[PDB]
Design a protein around this nucleic acid. Structure first.
Ligand SMILES: Cc1cn([C@H]2CC[C@@H](COP(=O)(O)OP(=O)(O)OP(=O)(O)O)O2)c(=O)[nH]c1=O
Ligand SMILES: [Mg+2]
Length: 330
DNA sequence: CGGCAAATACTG
DNA sequence: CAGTAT
DNA sequence: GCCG
């Protein structure tokens, strides 16, 4: 399935252009449609060669096929030459951290057209300014090698003040990709408690040696802190700034946090959607049953948290065959 | 046609 | 609450 | 966008 080579790269390459286009424009679902088809093509055991062949792949309809036939026969899609040249800018703006569809739309509607304009005439949030300062660096993905060296840093720094702590790099890393956009580290402790309030001793230790360089999201006042979104950079010459993502969780939620943080996103939403049909609910906390809702139908009480010691148990209960991380791209 | 790829955590 | 982010 |  997934872990195979894209036999239809030339096809998806272009469709991918539309997907992103419709996305920034706000057409969420239409873009979602393409996304699905694209993934379908990617995982196809062989390369598509005919119009009919495309129509046989679930997720591909006439319209989509019509575009496939054009590319397979002319090597070029016409729809691409007719995209508001306003999209490039939007795509450019939304690529800023903390900047999304709305924000990117706002700036454009205000005259801005280049990162130079925004870099001097736009109203930026502490987050956005950081995303802009490291714009070029956040565009590049890192080698599984570098990613690994980052996890180790966070881990050794954690086990530095408690060897019991367990650190695991999830996300694209755990799915075994060759490159990672960022490093998603999950931290917990077997004694189901030694994890409580440790961000301070961790974040400080990182800042101390200079590892961490920026902070995007981190409520360091409260002790109920859960996630951390910042920027780091390993020692040495020619080092780029990488996006870090760390979360601390109770050893009693490990199985559900690992599933979540491992993703992928599409995979999560999909799986979570399924649970919703079995009268359950999935999250990084646990897999529960239907919540208590009074006459009105208002959630008045939590559902019964089912026992999920490992990931496998989550699937079993959901009535699905366990899928390796690598096979969870979508 | 309308639903579809969710549940949750931070920031003004 | 709206927007952005996992 | 595709699908029930
Ligand atoms: C954005 C997002 C993410 N997730 C989960 C599931 C994956 C992890 C890691 O996220 P990331 O985007 O780094 O993904 P990753 O797969 O690591 O890819 P990169 O290499 O970082 O791009 O977070 C989710 O459930 N819903 C979302 O909307
Ligand atoms: Mg990641």
């Amino acid at each position: 399935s997934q872990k195979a080579t894209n036999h239809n790269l030339h096809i998806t390459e272009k469709l991918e252009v539309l997907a992103k286009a419709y996305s920034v424009q706000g057409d969420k679902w239409r873009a979602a449609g393409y996304a699905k088809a694209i993934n379908a093509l990617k995982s196809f055991h062989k390369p598509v060669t005919s119009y009919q062949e495309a129509c046989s792949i679930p997720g591909i309809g006439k319209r989509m096929a019509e575009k496939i036939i054009e590319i397979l026969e002319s090597g070029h899609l016409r729809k691409l030459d007719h995209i508001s040249e306003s999209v490039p800018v939007l795509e450019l703006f939304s690529n800023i951290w903390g900047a999304g569809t709305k924000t990117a739309q706002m700036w454009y509607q205000q005259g801005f057209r280049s990162l130079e304009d925004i870099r001097s005439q736009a109203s930026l949030t502490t987050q956005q300014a950081i995303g802009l300062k490291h714009y070029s660096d956040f565009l590049e993905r890192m080698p599984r090698e570098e990613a690994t060296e980052i996890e180790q840093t966070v881990q050794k720094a954690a086990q530095a003040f408690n060897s019991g702590l367990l650190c695991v790099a999830c996300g694209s890393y755990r799915r075994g990709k060759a490159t990672c956009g960022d490093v998603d580290v999950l931290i917990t402790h077997p004694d189901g408690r030694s994890h409580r309030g440790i961000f301070s001793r961790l974040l400080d230790s990182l800042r101390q040696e200079g590892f961490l360089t920026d902070d995007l999201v981190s409520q360091e006042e409260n002790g109920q802190q859960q996630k951390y979104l910042g920027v780091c950079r390993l020692p040495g010459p020619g080092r780029r700034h990488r996006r870090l993502d760390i979360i601390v969780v109770p050893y009693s939620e490990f199985a559900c946090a690992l599933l979540y943080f491992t993703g992928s996103a599409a995979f999560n939403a999909s799986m979570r959607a399924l649970a919703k049909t079995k009268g359950m609910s999935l999250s990084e906390h646990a897999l529960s049953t239907a919540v208590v809702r009074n006459t009105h139908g208002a959630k008045v009480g939590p559902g019964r948290v089912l026992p999920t010691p490992t990931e496998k148990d989550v699937f079993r209960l959901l009535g699905l065959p366990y899928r390796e991380p690598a096979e969870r791209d979508w």
